[PDB]
Amino acid sequence: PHDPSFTPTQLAARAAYLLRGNDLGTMTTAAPLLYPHMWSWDAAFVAIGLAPLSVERAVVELDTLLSAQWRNGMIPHIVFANGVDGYFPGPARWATATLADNAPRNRLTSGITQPPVHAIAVQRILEHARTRGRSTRAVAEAFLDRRWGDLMRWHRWLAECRDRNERGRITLYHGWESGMANSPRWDSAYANVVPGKLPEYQRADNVIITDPSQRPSDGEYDRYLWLLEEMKAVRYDDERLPSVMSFQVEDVFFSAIFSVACQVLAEIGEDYKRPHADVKDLYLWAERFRAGVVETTDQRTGAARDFDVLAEKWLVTETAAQFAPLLCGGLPHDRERALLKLLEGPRFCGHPDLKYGLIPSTSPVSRDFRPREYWRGPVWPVLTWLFSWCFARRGWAERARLLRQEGLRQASDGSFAEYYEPFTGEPLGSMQQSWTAAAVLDWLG
Amino acid sequence: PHDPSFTPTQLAARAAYLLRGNDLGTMTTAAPLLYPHMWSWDAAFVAIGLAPLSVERAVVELDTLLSAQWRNGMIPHIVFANGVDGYFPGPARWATATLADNAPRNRLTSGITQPPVHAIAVQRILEHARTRGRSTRAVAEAFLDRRWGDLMRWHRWLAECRDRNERGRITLYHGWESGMANSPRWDSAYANVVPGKLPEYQRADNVIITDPSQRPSDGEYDRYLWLLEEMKAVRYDDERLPSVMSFQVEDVFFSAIFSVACQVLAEIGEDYKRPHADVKDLYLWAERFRAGVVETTDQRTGAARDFDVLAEKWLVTETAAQFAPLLCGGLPHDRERALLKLLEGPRFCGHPDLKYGLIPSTSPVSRDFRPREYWRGPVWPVLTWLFSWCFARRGWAERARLLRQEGLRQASDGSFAEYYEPFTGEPLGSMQQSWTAAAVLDWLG
Amino acid sequence: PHDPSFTPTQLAARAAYLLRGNDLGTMTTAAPLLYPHMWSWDAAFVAIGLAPLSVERAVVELDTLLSAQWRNGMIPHIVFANGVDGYFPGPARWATATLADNAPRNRLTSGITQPPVHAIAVQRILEHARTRGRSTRAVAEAFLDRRWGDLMRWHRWLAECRDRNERGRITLYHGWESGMANSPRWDSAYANVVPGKLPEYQRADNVIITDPSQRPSDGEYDRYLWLLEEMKAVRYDDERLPSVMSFQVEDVFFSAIFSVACQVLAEIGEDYKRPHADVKDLYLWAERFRAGVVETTDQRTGAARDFDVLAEKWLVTETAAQFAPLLCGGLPHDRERALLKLLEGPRFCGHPDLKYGLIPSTSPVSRDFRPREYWRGPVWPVLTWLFSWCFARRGWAERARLLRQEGLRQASDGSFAEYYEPFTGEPLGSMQQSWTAAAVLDWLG
Amino acid sequence: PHDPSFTPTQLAARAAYLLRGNDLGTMTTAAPLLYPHMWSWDAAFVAIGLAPLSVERAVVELDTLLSAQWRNGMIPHIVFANGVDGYFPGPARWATATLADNAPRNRLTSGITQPPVHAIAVQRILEHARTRGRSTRAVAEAFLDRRWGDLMRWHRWLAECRDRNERGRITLYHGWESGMANSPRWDSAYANVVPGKLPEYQRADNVIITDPSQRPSDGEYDRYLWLLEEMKAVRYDDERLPSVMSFQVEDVFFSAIFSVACQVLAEIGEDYKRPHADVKDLYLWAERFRAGVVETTDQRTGAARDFDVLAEKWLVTETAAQFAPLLCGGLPHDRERALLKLLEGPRFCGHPDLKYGLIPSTSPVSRDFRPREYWRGPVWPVLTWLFSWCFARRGWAERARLLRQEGLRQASDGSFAEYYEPFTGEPLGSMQQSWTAAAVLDWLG
Ligand SMILES: O=C(O)[C@@H](CO)O[C@H]1O[C@H](CO)[C@@H](O)[C@H](O)[C@@H]1O
Ligand SMILES: O=C(O)[C@@H](CO)O[C@H]1O[C@H](CO)[C@@H](O)[C@H](O)[C@@H]1O
Ligand SMILES: O=C(O)[C@@H](CO)O[C@H]1O[C@H](CO)[C@@H](O)[C@H](O)[C@@H]1O
Ligand SMILES: O=C(O)[C@@H](CO)O[C@H]1O[C@H](CO)[C@@H](O)[C@H](O)[C@@H]1O
Structure with missing residues (x-):
């Protein structure tokens, strides 16, 4: 009518109503139909949203995700709901159950990873729990007792297996691992992905979202699905991915998130008397990936660049990932001021046509910008x-x-x-x- | 900690989280475990609470309740969830499925009724829907199209079958129909209930609520369950209940709620162009039950009295039901001022030991008062x-x-x-x- | 920026900041410059706005207004601030200090009245005071002791001197008394106001509001000022005004406000044990003016008409004053539904071009409608x-x-x-x- | 009644009502009667409170304070309201108008200073102005143009004249300069203040606050007033004060505030293109006083100590001033964790008897603690x-x-x-x- 907006209490009520509605019991789907399974970094944000409602249920969400962690420490990006169809690529297409020696026995999962925002969710759970009294604090502290080792294994796998040369940046083997598979960031790396005999498939995502301007193209999906074939052919073996994968990029936004998450998890470790050796390693990784992020940055604007490992070239694009150094710190004073100027100026938050003063995923002034896509x-x-x-x-x-x-x-x-x-x-x-x-x-x- | 209260947005979020958590799909349980089924007047209040969250789902709640309406118009007070145990008396004890010719074929229900707050929930749904735009208005208007006749049959059954002498007060055959089975209101009528050979049973309610000070006694339950036997022996036949029931009371609070609900439903009928004959009947009942409520009132304080039909005596007790005339109107100016003085004074909201300025179910100064029970x-x-x-x-x-x-x-x-x-x-x-x-x-x- | 609106807390703070900024000490000006004096019904609304900030200062506001009350009970519509210029007509033009035998010795005032919303402010003050404990209740009760008689004499002057024929409607001798001097309501009465030798004057209002579209015309001010000359010629004598005034109208909106105010003041009188004869008179006047308002209404739509006493003619216009019966009650059921349909429909709150669902002072579809004026x-x-x-x-x-x-x-x-x-x-x-x-x-x- | 607390909107309104009520025109008194003049750091906080109400009036507050700035750059801690009595020591006792060659001609002031929170108020004003559009940004930017030089001269006087030895800590000659004249911090320095012939005086503060437990003792005021005699004897000359003052302390809390204020003002200078040499000096001072604060700290706990320059002795006390390093940064990681543990623990915010989780001015477990004083x-x-x-x-x-x-x-x-x-x-x-x-x-x- 005259304004279809909701009051803050109405909006909070509807948000909680939604989150409970997407709860299958011990996992929350990322969406009702398009994403009818548990996603890794979505699950961390879901736990943040559950923490004001139920610390116990927020903890359950992370417990369910961590129960699907691979034997080598990798948290896969999808934990499939048993018996649920409607998402492609589904468990049959990943085939990690039959091909991945490290996949968990009791969960169906994808075979790739996603950004390590999980420590941030743990911090929010702990902050809520400390306001709620003894029994709720005990729930959150029991979760740390139960899962600190798994969280350490997750960070260690990232640091040791996706930064094999200790460059302080995380290598990805699929655009989906960045969270942003069709970002302009990856266009030139995808141009070097040439599918072989790709098994036939039918997308599900654009059956649910039928407006073609809002989802990637079939040509993009062909490359996304071919990368799966390359992983499957080597049974998802970490040691063989560098030799076979047609897509290998250092993701500077993922890297900055990891720097932050290491520092956050280290502070949690100090506060809750976790092993000193673990805290020491977390602070070392926090500093290594901060330095790795800064090393990529434009000398004028401070903007962070991704890196194409196969092409050996810096990827220079105009997306929100450029602002990675703002997350983790480390830029010299003058260059961080320039980066903030870029953030607030007409190429991003200050663009005059934006309805809200928010950060678009790609700059509206970039030739790659698509306002719906x-x-x-x-x-x-x-x-x-x-x-x-x-x-x-x-x-x-x-x-x-x-x-x-x-x-x-x-x-x-x-x-x-x-x-x-x-x-x-x-x-x-x-x-x-x-x-x-x-x-x-x-x-x- | 220093204050374990929640902010308004936190509280609204948690309330919506709870209501969705008690949703079984198309009915909401009244509580998670103690009341793991749909209750009639609870369902009306649940629909009020769902209306700010989803007009569609609020409508579903009333549709489910009305699908269990008896062939004669009675809305039974429990609609049992299929396959759910843990509440006594359960469907086996009521036996309406085998004994009640008017019970619905496709739902298990109890055999008694509850207060007609349902029109009030319809009004709140309509008020929300009108703020939400065309598609949401269409949902609420389709509900009226589908269920106006059922709502009319519900009110007509009350007016014709529970006010057979047109006294403007509703007769009840069980304290549970008042919503308040252990109210001091009913003590003298229950004293005239003498069970015969009562089939053995085990309570469930005090397994879930184990503190005995918070629930009725076994002796009270014996009388509650014996009244069921009397109804079952005549197969829940309306025409035979006056001849056989050991408990027959005119409930003045139920009567005042009915007066209000008739006026509310009549106004809805005018606004949405329902049949004129229906609106006329609703206004007639609104006035009849308003007058019936006022006829009971104390000539000094305005307080409303219940009536024991079998004993032929006014029931004079000190409970919140005394304030029935405030709900529906009709008292002369001076007596309603006296009633409001009673409400606000030291026997109710103004009692000096109350933590909050709220209406206790029984006056704290009554000998019958029990602060936990x-x-x-x-x-x-x-x-x-x-x-x-x-x-x-x-x-x-x-x-x-x-x-x-x-x-x-x-x-x-x-x-x-x-x-x-x-x-x-x-x-x-x-x-x-x-x-x-x-x-x-x-x-x- | 993207949203120049204030939050509720920011807005409440700015509103209180404004009210204290317009406080001259014991009176609040109606505006900083356009209305740099105390106005009568503005002062009632100011007291309502002060009540959540300081019951003491809210009471002072009404004490200051009532200290300007005329000896016959009239509350004049302007109480001038000593030594303040910049408003026309100012004290020298009214000349009540030399011409009006009933004007107060210690205040400069106008010589006409304004609507009696004052009892409503007293109710709001009392409601706030009752939530703020004993010392604040004492302040408000002491105001009642001090000013009950003055409030009675205000209502009595209205009932006896502006309703000489006991028609239950208030007669006005100036459009300014209605609050709405250029309302289309008065156009046909003003058309029979033929100025004689009008002493020269210079407007002040359109020096402060320079946009001519927002204020009345010079021709309209000539008529407003000529009516002052007619009053002055008879020394503002109540007994002579009906013989000489070229403008004499029954104001149905003022009359409905008076009905409400009498009922409100009567309930205050009952609650605070004021004299029985006063309470009885107040209820009598409330009923009389309720009936007088209903007598004006269209039998189809319920719309209330004003009355031109000199022309002996109902004044039929499309302004917010038509809704007078909604304020005081009294309409038959069908007629009030019809009037509510007019209010909510496309001639008022439902007009499709309105920015907000609010009541314009004149219907946007009226030929007399001017969106700025x-x-x-x-x-x-x-x-x-x-x-x-x-x-x-x-x-x-x-x-x-x-x-x-x-x-x-x-x-x-x-x-x-x-x-x-x-x-x-x-x-x-x-x-x-x-x-x-x-x-x-x-x-x- | 049951809850005398105000809602957020009521509280915001009452707070704005108060601030406007304490406004004398161009200065806001620190309180209505106890402090009926302008105080220096109070005026900074008042400007912060005015910024959401009127950026223009917030700027006026700082303009009025700075108009009282001494010729050497000192901002005095009291700017007296013309013709206002009721505070002691008042202007006649300070005698700066006749004795202090640097005192302003057009204002009566005290002859000592107070903490430099002023840059923080400028930041809050600028942040509000940037959300309120161009005309309001112009007001705040014009204030920067008009007063940047005065703010620099304030910071320079602190850095050069109260840190003569470039130790990175501010020297005070009176406990009133710390803001906390009766803090346990100063007890051992005051113990070496031996008054001589002190002219007679009558306190005003304990006429307005009559409860003796809430205010310092007569013995303490004798020492406060004797220090005024020592300053007056040398005409408040910066060059002579170190030779004569019986009280000379380095205030670590004031020093940390100054470090923060310099960094804040430097960032303002960068954002508004102020002279490079000013920005460079501001960053130099921010670092110098950050280091000076860290130098005071206990190597185990991080607690900051004040320094008695005359006794050449660290002042070890348990007050909120110990937390000075938390404001400005600079502590090694382990030491800051230790200091945060002190802050949150049972000696401060964690004390089990506190009504609110807040920082008391002295530790409740200190022998010097007095809960009212x-x-x-x-x-x-x-x-x-x-x-x-x-x-x-x-x-x-x-x-x-x-x-x-x-x-x-x-x-x-x-x-x-x-x-x-x-x-x-x-x-x-x-x-x-x-x-x-x-x-x-x-x-x-
Ligand atoms: O498009 C998809 O099928 C999935 C595959 O992971 O990605 C989107 O959907 C996921 C679920 O919300 C997000 O985690 C991703 O960041 C991304 O927005
Ligand atoms: O005690 C019970 O077993 C049920 C039986 O109907 O009554 C309570 O529980 C019901 C479910 O909340 C309410 O509708 C009633 O008013 C009452 O409080
Ligand atoms: O225009 C004027 O000069 C005054 C005359 O009384 O009226 C307006 O201004 C007065 C003060 O705000 C109001 O009380 C009136 O209702 C009206 O809007
Ligand atoms: O006690 C006094 O007379 C004044 C002297 O400056 O100090 C208090 O009062 C001043 C005004 O509120 C504050 O600025 C101080 O920090 C302190 O609390």
């Missing part, structure tokens, strides 16, 4: 949340507040959209996306 | 909500606001208790009670 | 407040809530404008208008 | 605000949020007390204290 332009509430939380942690209280305020204004339609059109504010992707509700729940306090 | 004293959030809504509808904006404010203060522990100790505020009865969350959700706006 | 069309926050408060007192809780919600949305720019353009929401008239801040303060709670 | 124990809302703002700037978002939440809980009585009893929450000192209202206004947002 998944990670090629739309504004993602999950990125707003991650940037706002990391900015508050840098001490940039007012910058963080402004992102939270605009994110709540954007979410006040109650669509809990996966992403939003940057100019019109139209909800895009899946509606009722779990991590969009989780951002709103964490923000509203 | 179900309907014999505790403060019930559902009654706070009903009184506050009816008071706002009388035009008593500040009185209604004060009840809402104290009700939210009391509920801010997030226990969503079934009822609360009036002096200490201790949560009692079931935790996570659906209609307590619904009151909070409606209030918070 | 004072009382000929703009939306007035003070009317929104008065309608919402009276609607809640009728029991129309949702209708009242919707007006409050839209009024807060409109006021969220922080301009505290006198009135707003109905289609664009542009702030018009004076900024920093005291009764717009008071409405916001009362609403926000 | 000014800076010897009470909880000061202004310190809560300063710690919370600095903590958020460190990146400690949850720690800052908890202080704000508890500070708002404590302030929800609406007394706006100067300080509060740490165990009972009783309001103490002056009511209606301006910087307590300003803290609430900044927090509520």
Whole structure:
């Protein structure tokens, strides 16, 4: 009618209603239909959104994810719900159950990883639990007792197996591992992926999201699915991926997230008297990946570049990933001021046509910008949340507040959209996306 | 810790989280374990609590309840969840499936009724829907098209079959039909219930609520269960209940609720162009039961009395039911002022030991008062909500606001208790009670 | 930036900041410059806005107004601030200090009256005081002791001297007494006001509001000032005014306000044990003016008409005054439904081009509608407040809530404008208008 | 009644009402009667509280303070209101108008200084102005143009004249300069202050605060006033004070504030293109005083010590000043963790008897603790605000949020007390204290 927005209490109520509605029992789907399984970094954001509602159930969410952790420490990016269809590529296509010696016996999972935001969710659970009294603190502390080792194995696998040369950057073998498979970041690396005899398949994602402008193309999916074939042919063996994979990139945004997560997990380890050797290793990785991120940065603007390991070239694109060094710190004073100027100026948050003062996934002034197309332009509430939380942690209280305020204004339609059109504010992707509700729940306090 | 209360957004979020958690699919249980089925007047309050979250799902809740309506128009007070145990008396004990010719074929139900608050829930659904735009208005209007006749049959059954002498008061054959089975209101009528050979049974309610001070006694349950035997022996036939039932009371609070509900449903009928004959009948019943309520009232204080049909005597007790005339109107000016003075004074809301300025189910100064014992004293959030809504509808904006404010203060522990100790505020009865969350959700706006 | 609206806490703070800034010490100006004096019904609304801030200062505001009461009971519509210029007509033009035998010795005032909303402010003060404990209740009760007699003499002067024929409607001798001097309501009465030798004058209002479209015309001010000459010629004598005034109208909106105010003051009198004869007179007047308002109404639509006493003619116009019967009650059921349909429909709150669901001062479809011009069309926050408060007192809780919600949305720019353009929401008239801040303060709670 | 607390909107409104009520025109008194003049660091906090209400008036507050700046750059701690009495020592006792060659011609002031929080207020003004559009940004930028040089001269006077030896700590000649004249911090320095012939005087502070337990003793005031005699004897000459003053201490809390203020002002200078040499000096001083603060700290616990320059002795006490290093940064990792453990533990925020999780001015377990006595124990809302703002700037978002939440809980009585009893929450000192209202206004947002 005259304004279809919701009040803060109405919005918080609807966000919690959604998150419980996507709960299958011990895992929350990332969306009702498009993503009807557990996703790894979504599950961390879901736990953040559950923490104000039930510390016990937030802990269950991470327990379920960690129960699917591979024998070598990798957290796979999908934990499939038993008997659930409607998502492709599904467990039959990954075939990790029959081909991956490290895959868990009692869960079906994908064969690739996703960004290590999980320590941040643990910190939010602990902060909520400490406000709730003894029995709730005991729940969160029992979770640490039970899962500290698994969290360490996850970070160690990243540091040792995806940074084999100790360059302080994480190597990815699939664009899906960045969280942003169709980002302009990866276009030139995908151009060097030439599928062989790719087994026939039918997409499911664009049956649910039928507007073709909102999802990747068939040609992109052919390359996404071919990379799976290459992993399967070597049975997902870490030692063989560098020799066979047609896509090998160092992801500077994933790397900065890992730097932050190591520092966060290290602080948790000190607070809860975890083994000193573990805390020492976490701080070492935090510093190594901070330095690895800074090494990539533009000498004028501070913007961070990804790296194509096969082509041996810096990937220079105009996306939100450029702001990786803002997450983890480490830039010299003058270059971080330049990077913040880029963030706030007309190429990103200050673009004059934006409905909200938020960070588009791709700069609206880039030739690669597509305002509807998944990670090629739309504004993602999950990125707003991650940037706002990391900015508050840098001490940039007012910058963080402004992102939270605009994110709540954007979410006040109650669509809990996966992403939003940057100019019109139209909800895009899946509606009722779990991590969009989780951002709103964490923000509203 | 220093204050374990929740903010308004945290509380609204937790209330919605609870209501979705008690949703079995198309019905919401009244509580997780103590009441693991659909109850009739609880379902109306659940629909009120769902309306800010999903008009579609609020409508589903009433559709499910009305699908269990008996062939003669009676809405039974329990609609059992298929395959669910843990509540006594359960479907086997009622035996309406085999003995009640009017019971629905496709639902298991109890054999008695409960207060007709359902029109009030329809009004709240309609008010929410009108703020939400065309598609949501169409959902609520389709519900009226589908269920107006059933709602009329429900009111007609009450008016014709439970007020056979057109006295403007509803006759009950079980204390459970009042919603308040152990109220001091009914003690002298129960004293005239003498069980014959009562089939052996085991309670379930005091397995879940083990503190004996919070639930009725075994002796009370023996009388509750014997009344079932009397109904079963005549196969729940309306025409035979007056000849056989050992408990027959005119419930003045139920009667006042019915007066209000008739007026509310009549206004809905006018607004949505329902049949004129129906609207005329609803207004006639609204006036008849208003007059029936006023006829019972104390000539000094305005307090309303129940009536024992078998003993032919006015039941004079000191409970919240005395305030029935405040709900429906009709008292002369001077006597309603006296009744409000009683409400606000030291026998009820103004009692000096109360933690919150709320209406205890029994006056703390009555010899019958028990601060823990179900309907014999505790403060019930559902009654706070009903009184506050009816008071706002009388035009008593500040009185209604004060009840809402104290009700939210009391509920801010997030226990969503079934009822609360009036002096200490201790949560009692079931935790996570659906209609307590619904009151909070409606209030918070 | 992207959103120049204030949060509820920011807006409440700015509203209180404004009200204290317009405080001269013991009186609050109606605006900083346009209305740099105390106005009568503005002072009632200011007291309502002060009640949540300081019951003591709210009481002072009404004490200051009543200290200016005329010896016959009239509350004049302007109490001039000593030594303050910049408003015309000012004290020298009214000349009540030399001509009006009933004017107070110690205050400079105008010589006409304004609507009796004062009892409503007393109710709000009492309601706040009762939530704030004994010392604050004592302040408000002491005000009742000190000023009950003055309030009675105000209501009695209205009932006996402006309703000489006991028709239950208030006669006015100036459009300014209606609050709405350029309302289309008065156009045909003004058309029979033929000025004689009118002494020269210079307007001050359109020096401060320079946009000519927002204020009445010079021709209209000539008639406003000529009526002052007619009053002055008979020394403002109540007994002579009917013989000489060229403007004599029965104001149905003023009459409905008076009915409400009498009923409100009667209930205060009952609650605080004021003399029985006063309470009885107040209820008698409430009923008399309720009936007088109903007598004006169209038998189909319920719309209330004003009456031109000199022409002996019903004044049929399409302004917010038509809704007078909604404030005081009394209409038959069918007629009130019809009037509510007019209010909510496309001629008023339902007009498709309105920015906010609010009541414009003149219907946008009326030929007399002017969207910028004072009382000929703009939306007035003070009317929104008065309608919402009276609607809640009728029991129309949702209708009242919707007006409050839209009024807060409109006021969220922080301009505290006198009135707003109905289609664009542009702030018009004076900024920093005291009764717009008071409405916001009362609403926000 | 049952709950005398105010809602967030009511509290924000009352806080703004108070601040406007203490406004004399161009200066805001620190309290209505106890402190009926402008105080220096109070005026910074008042400007912070005014920024959400009127950027223009917030700027006026700092313009008025800086118009009283001494010719050598010192901002004096009191700017007296013309013709206002009731505070002692007043202008005649200081005699700066006749004795101090650097005192301003057009203002009566004291002859000592106070902590340099002023840059923090400038930052908050700028942050508000940037959310309010171009005309308001122009007001704040014009203030920078007009007053940047004065702010530089204030910081330069501190750095060059109160840190003559470039030790990175500020020397004080009076306990009043610390803000906390009766803090246990100064007891051993005061013990070596031996008054000579002290001219007779009559205290005013304990006429307004009559409870002797809330204010310093007569013996303490004799020493405070004797230090004024020593300053007066040398005409307040910066060059002579070290030779004559019986009280000379390095204040580590003042020093940490100065470090923060320099860094804040440097970032403002970079953002608004102020002279490079100024920005460079500001960063140099920020680093120098950060290091000077760290040099004072216990190597185990991180607790910061003050220094008695005359005794050449570290002053080891248990007050909130120990936490100075948390404001400015610089501690080694292990030492800062230890200091945070002290802050959160049973000697401060964790003490089991505190009503609120807040920082008392003296540790409750210290032998010097007095729960009512000014800076010897009470909880000061202004310190809560300063710690919370600095903590958020460190990146400690949850720690800052908890202080704000508890500070708002404590302030929800609406007394706006100067300080509060740490165990009972009783309001103490002056009511209606301006910087307590300003803290609430900044927090509520
Ligand atoms: O498009 C897909 O099929 C999945 C595959 O992982 O990715 C999207 O969907 C996932 C589930 O929300 C997210 O984790 C990703 O970041 C991404 O937005
Ligand atoms: O005690 C019980 O077993 C049930 C039987 O109907 O009654 C309570 O529980 C029901 C479910 O909440 C309520 O509808 C009733 O009013 C009452 O409080
Ligand atoms: O235009 C004027 O000069 C005055 C004359 O009384 O009226 C307006 O201004 C007055 C003060 O705000 C209001 O009381 C009136 O209702 C009206 O809007
Ligand atoms: O006690 C006094 O007379 C004054 C002297 O400056 O100090 C208090 O009062 C001043 C004004 O509130 C504060 O600035 C101080 O920090 C302190 O609390």
